[PDB]
Write a protein that binds this ligand. Sequence first.
Ligand SMILES: CCSCC/C(=N\C=C1\C(COP(=O)(O)O)=CNC(C)=C1O)C(=O)O
Ligand SMILES: CCSCC[C@H](/N=C/c1c(COP(=O)(O)O)cnc(C)c1O)C(=O)O
Ligand SMILES: CCSCC[C@H](N)C(=O)O
Ligand SMILES: CCSCC[C@H](N)C(=O)O
Ligand code: NA
Ligand code: NA
Ligand code: NA
Ligand code: NA
Lengths: 466, 466, 466, 466
Amino acid sequence: AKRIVEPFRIKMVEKIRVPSREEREAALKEAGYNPFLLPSSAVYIDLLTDSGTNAMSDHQWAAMITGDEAYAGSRNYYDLKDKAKELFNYDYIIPAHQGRGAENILFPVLLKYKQKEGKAKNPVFISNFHFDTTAAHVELNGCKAINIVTEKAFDSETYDDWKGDFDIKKLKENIAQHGADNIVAIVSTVTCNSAGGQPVSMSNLKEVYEIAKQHGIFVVMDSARFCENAYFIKARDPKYKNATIKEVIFDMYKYADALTMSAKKDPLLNIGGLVAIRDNEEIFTLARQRCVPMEGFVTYGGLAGRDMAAMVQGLEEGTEEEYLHYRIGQVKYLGDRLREAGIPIQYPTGGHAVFVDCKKLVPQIPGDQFPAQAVINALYLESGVRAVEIGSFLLGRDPATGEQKHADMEFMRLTIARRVYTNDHMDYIADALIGLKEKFATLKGLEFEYEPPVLRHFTARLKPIE
Amino acid sequence: AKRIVEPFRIKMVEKIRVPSREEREAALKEAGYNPFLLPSSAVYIDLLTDSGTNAMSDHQWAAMITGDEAYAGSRNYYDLKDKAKELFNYDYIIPAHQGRGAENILFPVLLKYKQKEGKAKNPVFISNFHFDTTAAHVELNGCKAINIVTEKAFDSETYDDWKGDFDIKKLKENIAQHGADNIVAIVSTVTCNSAGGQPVSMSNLKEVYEIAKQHGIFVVMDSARFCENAYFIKARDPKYKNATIKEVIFDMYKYADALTMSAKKDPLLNIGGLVAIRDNEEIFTLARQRCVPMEGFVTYGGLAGRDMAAMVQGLEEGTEEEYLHYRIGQVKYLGDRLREAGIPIQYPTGGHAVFVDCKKLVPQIPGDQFPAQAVINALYLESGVRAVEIGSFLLGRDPATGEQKHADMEFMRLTIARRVYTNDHMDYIADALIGLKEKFATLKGLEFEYEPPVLRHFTARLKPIE
Amino acid sequence: AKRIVEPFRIKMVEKIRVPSREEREAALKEAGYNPFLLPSSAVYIDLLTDSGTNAMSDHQWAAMITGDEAYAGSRNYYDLKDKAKELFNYDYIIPAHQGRGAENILFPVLLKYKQKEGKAKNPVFISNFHFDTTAAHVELNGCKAINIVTEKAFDSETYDDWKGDFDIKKLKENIAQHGADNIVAIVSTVTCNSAGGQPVSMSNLKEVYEIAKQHGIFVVMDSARFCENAYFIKARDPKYKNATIKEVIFDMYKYADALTMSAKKDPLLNIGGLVAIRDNEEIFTLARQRCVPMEGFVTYGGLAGRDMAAMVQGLEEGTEEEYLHYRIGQVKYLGDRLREAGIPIQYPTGGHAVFVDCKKLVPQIPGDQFPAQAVINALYLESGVRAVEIGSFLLGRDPATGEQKHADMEFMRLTIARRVYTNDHMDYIADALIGLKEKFATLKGLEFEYEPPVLRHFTARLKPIE
Amino acid sequence: AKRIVEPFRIKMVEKIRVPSREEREAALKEAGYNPFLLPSSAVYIDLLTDSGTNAMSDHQWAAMITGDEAYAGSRNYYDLKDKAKELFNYDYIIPAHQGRGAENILFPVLLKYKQKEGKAKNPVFISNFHFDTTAAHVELNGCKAINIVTEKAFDSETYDDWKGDFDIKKLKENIAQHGADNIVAIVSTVTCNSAGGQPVSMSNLKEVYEIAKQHGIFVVMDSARFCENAYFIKARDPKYKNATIKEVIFDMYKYADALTMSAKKDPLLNIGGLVAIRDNEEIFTLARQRCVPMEGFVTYGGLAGRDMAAMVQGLEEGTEEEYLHYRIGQVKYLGDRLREAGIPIQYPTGGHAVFVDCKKLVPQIPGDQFPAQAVINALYLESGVRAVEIGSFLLGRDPATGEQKHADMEFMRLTIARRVYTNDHMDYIADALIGLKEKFATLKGLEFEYEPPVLRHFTARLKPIE
Ligand SMILES: CCSCC/C(=N\C=C1\C(COP(=O)(O)O)=CNC(C)=C1O)C(=O)O
Ligand SMILES: CCSCC[C@H](/N=C/c1c(COP(=O)(O)O)cnc(C)c1O)C(=O)O
Ligand SMILES: CCSCC[C@H](N)C(=O)O
Ligand SMILES: CCSCC[C@H](N)C(=O)O
Ligand code: NA
Ligand code: NA
Ligand code: NA
Ligand code: NA
């Protein structure tokens, strides 16, 4: 494993502590053996998410301090509009308070627009993989979300350059089967979050967009981790070997008509989202009308002026290749520490998180007793580190049968915030997990002390078994 | 007119400038004679809104700096939960990104709650007066909004203590006409923003709640300006003459079951909202499931940790009687400057804005040519002050005729941000408006160069007539 | 009296409170009836000084946040060097931690320089008026401080354009008497702080420098309030009616060889000082050598990087004419409030303070019983305002007879920080002092409970007589 | 070599960059081959000093934002007085703008105090080792600075627990030789900066204090790195291995009568200093009278209120053992990386810096050609790292002969700021120096292009010989 040095130094710190073992046991028992219920005060290194937990720069904080809080026509709104033109060549923006807000702005408008043409009678969206909130918004508006990620993504430990790719054969089949009139939009998610932060190649984006344009289908680039995707394109595609990151980004966005973005990810923010539309003014106008009742006025969209200011600066910083090399290299470093110690992971690592296959660590725990959660709980008890389950516990029950949905993989996700933790923190995570290797066989499954009907992973309370 | 000194001093300043007349000419023509389309760089004193434009304290900025950005279990979530229990005696909170986010969280849940017993076949909401966004969500969710404000409010220039009161007779008559089973909720807006930021008396709040509990009707307190309402209760109700402001607030919330709040008003913030529920855990649970797709995870709700931290502090500062006395007294001072010059206003002035009756200023301009907007535009051209229209331009067209819906009053709202402008800024505003008395007769109406089919006040491009 | 509106609005506030009547009485008693011993918690409006209590802009705070803390070669040191070249045309800078630090750097070097070829056996400094620290450093280095302000300054209530001018007659007479080989330097204090912040004319500065240059005398511009002096030159000198403030400043510094500056005044800082030398590289070199042991290394001089950053921005903001017009107008406003009410003041008001002649308010209190302190104490008891004494209590005892040195006048100084207080704060001060007109007769003098042998005004404890 | 993980995470970053090799060559040329003349923009990792370059916490920045800028009686002054009483049990404080400001306040007062006692006719100060500014102030006041560090300090590569100790026999000898009536003060420097940041044992501090008290000699603790010293006492003295760091600190200050402190070191600040006096009120009063003309009024001492606020917080944070173990462990890790690669260092490493013996690295370069500076310059040219010379260049010329003072050791100091650089930055430094092992013999000495008469290391320009 190779450590890559920070292309920055620390300007402000935030104290974190490891509770004593007895405190960690007490806290975890108190949280019903569900770390989502732990107070942050009980957590040392927090790996639940890379969303909104990033460290900003001094320039971002300085931009916040001079932010224009005007209700209409904030100076930072116009800066953000200019930045979107400069990065993406897109002519229209609507800020949002975060990414799911940007989806709530754009997606119902896209459906309405296609319906007003007499189409979208049986409406669907097609994506390489819809993210959780993306699919939920699609389904809230009476549309089917179809996911057609490449079969490369399902071979967890076998390397491939582009595990986030669309399956082009499936794309064409689905267009032919549903009809182009019924495809409200194609959503290109970069990197592909549900494939584990795996990149989509430039040629895949290009071919998807060419097909869509031939059919008149609108394409949305879901852009939370677009810089990480651009880095992978430059690293792995020989055509972009000598291109700058902004050149890669510029080309990527030739292959969408609009973007939705959680700015809480690659733009290095704690809050914020963005809609940008390449040049369809009609859709922009419709989206502005939905922005008003749902988010705010069209020149702040539920964002303080200071956060638009931080976004302008963070959009810039998030494209910096030296930072991206270090950020993605830190994720790869953690994965390599685990992989070299025999811990099975999704490989190669994506831009923002390492996925550990817990089914192989604790074979004795069946899926319906949540083996990845057992590993996560053990990890927390051992170290104060809080990870998140991507397995049976998260997948929930099948609403028709009331029984556990069979999970393809039982993943523990180690989600890495940007510019927050050092490689010594990475070693701490890796060493604590490696150090459980004699304990894995003894670990016990989990049962429900209390279960919600929906979204159970957030608030359910568990109890160990036997 | 009486100037009340600030119970604080200035710690940080933000430069503002008066654009030249020709800059103001070109900007208003560029904005299509709609000041909502003006960039803030074209605006001297901005009176569009008191929402999110407030000046924070050093303690609020300090709280932001130490804010906990944890995705789950943020230290500031628990502080906020503790704060709502202290001020309102409510046991459950859900943060939101702002006020209309709070409404979008709670109101659909209230409809589902009443409906799940066979009720709400013809569902309605009853308020003293729904603000714009509140009534837009009510109607977005298939319900009708009913504004049963006291008719005292419609006698613009005649003093009354409680021009925001419910009309109790209209409340009882609406409950009989529609039936208790169709009334999803009663919404008590404090202060009553649409009535001119006019207070609701404690005895009115009590009688509404008692009437509502007779029929099993849930009561929500729209609480964006609750502190200004508490001040007016202490100022005008003999029972609370010796009460602290917090004691007044505590009593107010005995007469609701939950609250929605834009924290961008009285809690002195630039962003932020809040749902609090007194004790109905079931409605809290349903509300948390809607918060997730629309806003964020339930322990930050579309808000950075730093904004929850600022909200905890701002909630405290917003209750401070010396501050409220000064703030409301500034609004009163501006009103008195105009009223003493023969400029007709809503009297008494409310908590956050002065409302000028422009029907009496430009009689030669009829409603369908937007008299209050002609006055606003003249004020902007004369001085660089940007105000906002509460008249025929806002009201829009009727869904039946496609013609101009008749407006009761043609108001110009001079909305005052908290702790931002001095009484010398007030004098600038008053003197610019007073100096238009020689030019009112010359002004002309406004016609549409561009009119969007909905929300026209935000983006329509008007044009001077003749 | 004319209120002048702020050319800015408030972005951050700082809470200040008026202690109750009983609280102020108890605090003043614990403070031994000396406001210099009051904790700030006991003070509402603080008028002790305009030094280091200014409100900064958002741009200044932003500059602090990105400040470069490098020990050597800070980006902000080069920015400050460039700024000094731009504003003053001076080629060399040495940052200092504040104004008296700048004097400690330069004045001993100037004396050693004058005592390096031949002899300055009776060394003296000559100023229109040495400020307290300036004269203290002069006397600490074995030199006499000679103050030769124009006699117009001593006609307290009669208007004059340039009450800060050098007496040209007394200058030529001092040079003839002491010889140009004993005059270590001439100090041009702009504005003349000890005269009451009164300006020095461009013609006066120029003639002083020409006289100094023909005698080979070095000229230092004491530049704490150099922008306020520039404002007064533009306002009152017809030659500069259409010059910019920066053009006025640029001309001022043609008439000195170096400057010492408290950046805690006109550059709008809370900490900071500066030495700048026009072109004498030898003086620069030796001054750098004293800087190292007394202040710090020469590229930060006892200042954090963020404070050099704030100083670069504040140097710019302090020259802005709209701000200077409001600032000096607010001081003039406080003085016109008192003058129109019969309270005697120095007229016209200087740039930064109002001076009240207290010997006329309490004639029954002789100089040796500190009548101006009795007015200050009464003012504090009535209002919580803290002012400072400039009279017999400050003047101290004559070290020979050990008795009260006769003070020519007894002043109370109402010193006004920059961008901190509103004109309503000014009214509050003025109305409190005016309201004491009926109590001025019954006021008692003060006597010593504890008196230090030196600097007694800072730590002495006083007791009301009778 | 053992990497110790951070007991904090990153909340704000500051971009740094490695200039190209072409840029580093051009910059070093422009700086006359003196890294002290490089702009910070030419520097990647800056190792010039650990003074004032530390990263603060979010709690420290929050304290700055609410800091009280009052001229007299600042809230943060009383907090600072309380904090000194808590940590040191000292009753009196005088804030200073930094450590040499604190020395300028206290040392002249101590001399006058001993002289007024009819003594101090041939005055001296005795220290384990006076720091540069300390010895400068001692000599500026006509006294001799006598350094009597343990001979264990001069066996550079051989471990010893307490290389900062006083030589007790030399202390007793010097007291007799000069006479107690001539010893103005004994200065206990903790850690002993000039011995390399090496600790002084508790028993040494105690014995030195008891000896001083037997002779009536005042003892000052020079306290810039008192927490690092307390850590070493806890780490190495079995008496204290169960004490808290604050218990160790509390015991240390039983063995002094006053302290001077650069708060730019262990209290984790970018600016600030402190005098504290244990109980001698007379010395406190005299030091206050010197504070006023030299630093500022006695309740801010040339510090903004925000910096007294940051100091209160940093004094607490600087005592935290988890932090100290990481900080000192990171310095140790850098030293172990070098030592394990055969690079000769002072061993054990001190609290704040690694010292590399460059005499062993470039034996072909004589001392008066500055071998350590050649290694430093080569390190910069290869890496962008800027280190500082502690050898013949710094040592300067002998006043009596004008020749190069012979240097016992030719050290390169790698000075490590607190909480700024990660262990990956340490690896970068070590790997760059280790990659020079094949270039050391080819390195050539330096000669003067420009040499100032004093303090030449700051400003002299050098040139490679041939
Ligand atoms: C003329 C339109 S400007 C909109 C800002 C604003 N009022 C917002 C209010 C909201 C929504 O809250 P937010 O989403 O945070 O805006 C809820 N309830 C009440 C009583 C309000 O007044 C104003 O200026 O009156
Ligand atoms: C409570 C009264 S004392 C506060 C000092 C302040 N004046 C400071 C000053 C200095 C010292 O500069 P600095 O060391 O930064 O204070 C030098 N030259 C001039 C012309 C000055 O006016 C003032 O009068 O209010
Ligand atoms: C069940 C994981 S919750 C984490 C949600 C976050 N917005 C994300 O992008 O992953
Ligand atoms: C060898 C230069 S010493 C310069 C002194 C400074 N306080 C420091 O810590 O470096
Ligand atoms: Na966040
Ligand atoms: Na805002
Ligand atoms: Na610094
Ligand atoms: Na200050």
